[PDB]
C-alpha cells in the first residue's frame, strides 16, 4: 500500500529531473523557447 | 499633351491599386489566422506543464 502511494510521485520523478537537461532539446523548447530565447518577448525591454 | 504628362500621374493612379492589392491582405490576416495563433497559448501550457 505504501509503495502504491509513492507511485504517482515515483512516475513523476523518472523524467522530472532529466527534464532540466531535456529543456534544451525540443521536448520543451516548442513552448519553453522563451528561456532559450531569454525572455522571448523582446529580451525584456530595451527599445521595442 | 497634358494627358501624356498626366499619364505618368495616371501611372501612379493605376499602380496604387497594386499597392492596395499588395497591402490589404495583411488586414485579413489578423482575423483569418486566429485558428493558427495557438502557439503561445500553448506556451501557457508549458508553465502549467509542471506535473
Swiss-Prot record, chain A:
This is AUGMIN subunit 4. Part of the augmin complex composed of 8 subunits. The complex acts on microtubules and interacts with gamma-tubulin in spindles and the phragmoplast. Involved in microtubules reorganization during spindle and phragmoplast development. Belongs to the HAUS4 family. It is found in: Cytoplasm, Cytoskeleton, Spindle; Cytoplasm, Cytoskeleton, Phragmoplast. It comes from the Eukaryota. It comes from Arabidopsis thaliana (Mouse-ear cress). Disruption phenotype: Lethal when homozygous. Transmembrane segments: none annotated.
Curated annotation (Swiss-Prot), chain B:
It is found in: Cytoplasm, Cytoskeleton, Spindle; Cytoplasm, Cytoskeleton, Phragmoplast. Disruption phenotype: Lethal when homozygous. Part of the augmin complex composed of 8 subunits. The complex acts on microtubules and interacts with gamma-tubulin in spindles and the phragmoplast. Interacts with AUG1. Involved in microtubules reorganization during spindle and phragmoplast development. Required for gamma-tubulin localization during mitosis. Belongs to the HAUS3 family. This is AUGMIN subunit 3.
Amino acid at each position: 500500500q505504501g509503495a502504491a502511494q509513492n507511485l504517482p510521485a515515483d512516475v513523476n520523478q523518472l523524467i522530472d529531473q532529466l527534464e532540466r537537461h531535456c529543456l534544451a532539446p525540443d521536448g520543451s523548447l516548442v513552448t519553453k523557447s522563451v528561456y532559450s530565447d531569454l525572455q522571448l518577448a523582446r529580451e525584456e525591454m530595451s527599445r521595442e | 499633351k497634358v494627358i501624356e504628362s498626366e499619364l505618368q500621374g495616371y501611372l501612379s493612379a493605376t499602380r496604387s491599386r497594386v499597392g492596395r492589392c499588395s497591402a490589404l491582405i495583411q488586414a485579413a490576416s489578423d482575423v483569418q489566422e486566429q485558428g493558427a495563433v495557438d502557439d503561445r497559448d500553448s506556451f501557457l501550457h508549458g508553465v502549467r506543464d509542471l506535473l
